[PDB]
Write a protein that binds this ligand. Structure first.
Ligand SMILES: Cc1c(C(F)(F)F)nc(-c2ccc(Cl)o2)n1-c1c(Cl)ccc(N2CC(C(=O)O)C2)c1Cl
Ligand SMILES: Cc1c(C(F)(F)F)nc(-c2ccc(Cl)o2)n1-c1c(Cl)ccc(N2CC(C(=O)O)C2)c1Cl
Length: 225
């Protein structure tokens, strides 16, 4: 009951130490929305510049996930090859999940470069379908009203996934996965939140979305290296 409770707190500590922005701030900033003139300003940027901006922000967000993983008890006990495979396959998925905190379902806006703005902010990039999908995903995750501890445990499980192709110690990643699943379950029971298990996105949906994402990202990169 303490080995589990300590694991839960280890994941929560690691998450807290590695998220960029406080939930309190993001909710506070909800009134601070981009003006029409400011939105137009973003829409008038070249695709090259918007891509440079976004790629930079995503590189940063991914770096925090690497840090999150380094502080996850058990992650660093895996062999380096497996660490890398998990990070390569899961970090962007974690970033996508983390972002639901910065998404406002009331007006379908996201916190971006200091203010809240809608889908249309990213028009210069010319991939409305992908962006719209990212917004839809965020919207449905935001309906769950994830707690900070729930985000920590859920994103830990996004990352520690034994089904990633390329693992050399699959059984050891399984052990960490199952311990985290039990920790998640234990924690939801104590908070009377077991209902959210019935409400989580189908695991493939997150893979699917981030595959579409990486597909477009590889197009961006071979356009502007
Ligand atoms: C693995 C890794 C490491 C670490 F910890 F291992 F040094 N640091 C980063 C990192 C920091 C900032 C960014 Cl951006 O990435 N990554 C990392 C990650 Cl988390 C995700 C994807 C990729 N990609 C997609 C490409 C591929 O699929 O080959 C390479 C990489 Cl390199
Ligand atoms: C514009 C874009 C692209 C694309 F299509 F250009 F690749 N991908 C994403 C993305 C989000 C999560 C993942 Cl995973 O990918 N965005 C995007 C979106 Cl839709 C919304 C907000 C933000 N940001 C950076 C800030 C933050 O770090 O919270 C707010 C970004 Cl970068």
């Amino acid at each position: 009951l303490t080995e589990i409770e300590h694991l839960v707190q280890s994941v929560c500590k690691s998450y807290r130490e590695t998220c960029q922005l406080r939930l309190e701030d993001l909710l506070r900033q909800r009134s601070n929305i981009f003006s029409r003139e400011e939105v137009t300003g973003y829409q008038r940027k070249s695709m090259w510049e918007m891509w440079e901006r976004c790629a930079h922000h995503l590189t940063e967000a991914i770096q925090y996930v690497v840090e999150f993983a380094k502080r996850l008890s058990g992650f660093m006990e895996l062999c380096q090859n497996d660490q890398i495979v998990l990070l390569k396959a899961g970090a962007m998925e974690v970033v996508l999940v983390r972002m639901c905190r910065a998404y406002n379902a009331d007006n379908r806006t996201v916190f971006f470069e200091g203010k809240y703005g809608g889908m249309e902010l990213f028009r210069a990039l010319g991939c409305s379908e992908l962006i719209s999908s990212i917004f839809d995903f965020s919207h449905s995750l935001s309906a769950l009203h994830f707690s900070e501890d729930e985000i920590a445990l859920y994103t830990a499980l996004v990352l520690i996934n034994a089904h990633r192709p390329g693992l050399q110690e699959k059984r050891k990643v399984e052990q960490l996965q199952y311990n985290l699943e039990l920790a998640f379950h234990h924690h939801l029971s104590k908070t009377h939140r077991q209902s959210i298990l019935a409400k989580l996105p189908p695991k493939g949906k997150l893979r699917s979305l981030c595959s579409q994402h990486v597909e477009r990202l590889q197009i961006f990169q071979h356009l502007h290296p």
